[PDB]
Amino acid sequence: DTRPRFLWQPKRECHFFNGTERVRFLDRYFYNQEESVRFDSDVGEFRAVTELGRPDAEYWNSQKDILEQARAAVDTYCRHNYGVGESFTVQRRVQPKVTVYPSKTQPLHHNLLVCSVSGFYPGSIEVRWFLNGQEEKAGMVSTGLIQNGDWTFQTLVMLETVPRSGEVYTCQVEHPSVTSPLTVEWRA
Amino acid sequence: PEVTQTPSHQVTQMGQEVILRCVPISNHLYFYWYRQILGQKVEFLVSFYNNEISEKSEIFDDQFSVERPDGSNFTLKIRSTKLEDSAMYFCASSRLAGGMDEQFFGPGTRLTVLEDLKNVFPPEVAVFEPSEAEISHTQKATLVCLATGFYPDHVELSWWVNGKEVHSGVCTDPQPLKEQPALNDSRYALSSRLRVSATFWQNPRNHFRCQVQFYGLSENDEWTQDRAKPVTQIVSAEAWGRAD
Amino acid sequence: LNVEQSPQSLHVQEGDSTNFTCSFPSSNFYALHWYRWETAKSPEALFVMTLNGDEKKKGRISATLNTKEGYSYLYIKGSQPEDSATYLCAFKAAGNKLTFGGGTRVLVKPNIQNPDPAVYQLRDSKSSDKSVCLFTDFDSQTNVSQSKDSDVYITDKCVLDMRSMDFKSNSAVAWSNKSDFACANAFNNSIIPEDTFFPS
Amino acid sequence: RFYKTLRAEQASQ
Amino acid sequence: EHVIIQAEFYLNPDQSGEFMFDFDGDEIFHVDMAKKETVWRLEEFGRFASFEAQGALANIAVDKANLEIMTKRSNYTPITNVPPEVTVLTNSPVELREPNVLICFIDKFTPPVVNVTWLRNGKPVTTGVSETVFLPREDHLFRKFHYLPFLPSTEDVYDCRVEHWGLDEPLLKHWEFD
Ligand SMILES: *[C@@H]1O[C@H](CO)[C@@H](O)[C@H](O)[C@H]1NC(C)=O
Ligand SMILES: [Mg+2]
Ligand SMILES: [Mg+2]
Structure with missing residues (x-):
């Protein structure tokens, strides 16, 4: 036309x-x-x-x-x-589905440690990364808030990591749908 | 600055197509048609804006239509007239397209739908001069007008004094009475009084007329009976001032 | 949906006030219309009420709106004869179409001065077999009842103002062609004042 | 309860 | 802090019109003009709230009239086509033999007219595909979501094909399993 x-x-x-x-x-x-x-x-x-x-x-x-x-x-x-x-x-509140996973390789090589936070409401979320119980202040590549358009959100906060066996990485998601900060773990 | 409608009244036979005319207010954006069946509430028929129907009754598309000929007129067409369609048809208009304003109604059209046009009769009109006792007792004079044997109802009675129509001194029955209440096809009667001072009635230069606008048969309607066609007409009676 | 008005009909004495009500839906309200419809004339708007708890005034007519409970009151302060009309109530939702109540027919009973109840005989002039009897100049208490004979016709009371001898008068008419019939008995089924003047 | 439309008005003129 | 928006439009000569309610970037409902009815975004909304479609229909009629007044007023000035920015993404992280939804996100465009086609192995897919209406942006451009429920396999190739008058050629946005 x-x-x-x-x-x-x-x-x-x-x-x-x-x-x-x-x-x-x-x-x-x-x-x-x-x-x-x-x-x-x-x-x-x-x-x-x-x-x-x-x-x-x-x-x-x-x-x-x-x-x-x-x-x-x-x-x-x-x-x-x-x-x-x-x-x-x-007053709509839908709980997020938090799932940690690597982008795959060998330890001692660098990797992005993904933290997929899916299907939540509202968009007010604070995602935090931890290395052996200590907050990683930098090296995070966020995707920001993704509006799914079905009254649902999703965000992916990948961590820039050099993994070593024995290290436990934990993703901490704070959101109104939960009274207690949700936690998922990935050990090297 | 009013909504106009024509005609005042209309008599029709069952199964016919009737076209009701209306002239909405010049600058107005919304037009409507409402109808009121005697005894029942005023019912919405159709809404119209920007050369398209807005809202319509459940009954509307099956039994009716609307035409916007020029940019001055608006019309409602009853496809096949039913006995249930005997009602007062109002045309309305609104200024704004937002709908938060008032609706202006036209004078309306009273449609009478008849099963058979055989029992239609015009009225007989007679004027009765004032009682001499009354003049002697009160120095007031009242003439009475009787309009009898008409079918159907809704007739327009008016008084004329020396050529001009009068509303002062006049009172007319708000409803006619049935001549034979045991009949469904009962003809009607109606009265009106005109009261003037004795001095006025006593001047023989004073002219008094009473006329009834009756609505009946159209010139196109079928008439096989011998009596004169009971067409829409003005029947009148008069009296002159008496010195006595 | 549905709008209801109460009472269907009302009588008020000239000088006295009255009020009536309108019940409309309590959900999806956009507006409420009040129209006055005199028998002769077309429905003419009084108020279009849109804001809940607002009160509108047009001279002696007044209206209140309660959106939350779905009702409206119309008030007529000190009735005058020109207020005799059918007062119509209309609800408007998202469109423009109005849903109407059955109305309230208001009848302002007049204040009749200097009554002189009388039954008179008018003359035929000259093309009718009918002789007419006029019951005139009675107060508003007097009530005109229907005829007990199928060949005698009686009309209800009607008020006229002369604006030449500027007073108001009530009157009713009775007629028959019957050889029998006379003004002395025409109004025998009605509650007539004791002092009604029958001339001879 | 009902969602209410803010009714639109025709432009000038 | 929230924002509710009644977002309408009428477009010529396409004679397309829209009416919807947006709460903080998401559709509460829109009105189906063909079927003259309210379409709730999430079924549950319909169970707690109501809406009279006539309010939209009356507004669209006015919108149609105003557009025609406006286009004559502007010495017949047309719109400047702003091409979209197509993005393919999934509802959840993908796992094989576990059903997922593909989201095609058309953004930052005007006029609100697009031809969106889902393709599996270069072939069009009509089964299960759902779509949003033209959603509003604070920059007065549009948004539009196209959905595709699918079963994740390593042999499938998905493409969202978008056609717009601001695009020189149909944009294809590809998705594939890692
Ligand atoms: C959609 O396709 C039809 C037919 O190919 C075409 O006329 C129209 O211009 C297309 N729309 C867009 C936005 O490209
Ligand atoms: Mg409220
Ligand atoms: Mg406006």
Whole structure:
């Protein structure tokens, strides 16, 4: 296909701070990925972000019923929708499947000691590496947070290691789904 | 700045196609059709925005349609008129596309669906001049208008004094009465009073007229009976001021 | 889904206030509409209520909204005759379609001054076999009952304002072609004031 | 409970 | 600290429209325009919450109208195609004869139109394949996940083929057992 494309993409945002104490609502409109006009709770009126959205901001602001619906979305829409999902959204907790494994070779050769942490929720995780019960502060090549898109995360924190027989390496994962830090071990 | 509808009333025979006309408010983005069967609640039929139906009744696509001819008009078509389709049909319109605003309703169209068009009759209209006792006792004069033997109901009675229509001094029955309550095809009767001062009725230069707009048969409808076609018509009666 | 209004019908004396209620769904609320529908006319909007706990006022008409318990109250302070209408209640969810309640038919019983109950005989002029009897100038306590004879027709009471002798009057009409029939007996099935004037 | 749509408005004019 | 987003769009002349809810980067639900119904991302959501699809459908109608107003206003200015960045990854670390899921991740692109094909040994695969709708990014570009449940073997070669108007040729992203 070669015909030219035109895209209008509205985005209605609800940003939450201290749970539901301070909520900020944004009504944003994008024409061809360029923002044309917006409504920001904290401003209280529609403002043109670009010259294309200037007639829209003038018109929508001159309509008392449009303004008062925007001005009240923070309780009517934001706070309301937050409370609808809270049980399965804000309070969703899925436990991670931690599994240590090498990238394979002989000891005394260098290797990457992987720590695959899979299928967890939320993305708030802290992964820590240990050599004989002492935290390895450096030599870690993380993959960062990978959003699986099925309300599930995954991260891989590989350790740069020169293994020697008798050494025990332990991966320590701290996450809200667990009361006690999860631990997996690999001995050289 | 109101929603318009035509016609005021419409009489039809079962199985026919009826086209109800409406003129939504000029700048308005949403159009609707609602209907109310006597005794029942006001029911949503169809919603329409940006040359496309928005929401529709469970009953809608099977029995109805909507056409947006020009950019001024909007119409509802009943495909095959049923006895159950005798109702008051309202056309409505909203300004905004967001739907948080009020709906403006038109005056409505009262549709009467009949099994057989044989029992349709226009009204007989008579004016009765004031009682002499009343004038002597109160110095007030009331004329009465009787509209009898009409079928079906929903008729429009009005008073005219010296050519101008009057609403002051007038009172008309909110509902007609059945002439024969034991019959399903019972013809109706209706009354109206017009009260004026004795001084006014006593001036013979004063003209009083009472007329009834009746809605019945169309010129295209089949009429085989001998009596005159009970077509939609205005039946009137009059009286002149009496010095006495 | 479903909207319910209570009572179906209501009577209030001119000068007195009344209130009525509307029960609508407690989930998926977007708005609540209140319309006034006078017999002659089309439904005309009074209020569109969107925020819970808000109260709206249009002169003497007032409304309250409770989203959480699914109800609304409409208040008419000091009824006037022009308030006689069917007050309709509508619920709006995510679309634009309104779901209606059965309504509350409000009847403002007028304050009748200087009653003079009388039954009069009007004359035929001249193309009818009917003789008409007018029961006029009675107070709002008087109630007009139906005829006990199938050939005599009686209409309910109706109020007119003259705005020339600017007072309000009640009246009912009785008629028959019958050789029998007279104004002295026309209204015999009704509870007529003792002092009703029958002229001779 | 129900998820509520923030109803969209037509642009100028 | 959380963020809920009602992310819509309408695209011409494709006449494609979308409506969805995003909680912190993940889809709560989207509305199926063909079937005029709510499609919950995770089945359990449907059991605790409800949604009236008309709200989306009414918004899409307005979105369709606004796009046409906007395109005339902009002297008929078209969108600039931004090609995607395709990534193949697995749900879990792979082990032979233990079922796993292949994730094809299309990212940082606009317009929201793509042809995604899974290939096993250069041949297309329709069995078990699931997909997400066009997910939103803070840079106003799109995301899209394509899933493939598979049985890990040492004889299989998997390829995610992605077609976009911002791409000169279909991008193939390969996956194979170590
Ligand atoms: C998808 O395939 C069809 C047919 O080959 C083609 O017309 C269309 O342009 C393709 N879409 C993209 C995004 O390449
Ligand atoms: Mg709430
Ligand atoms: Mg808006």
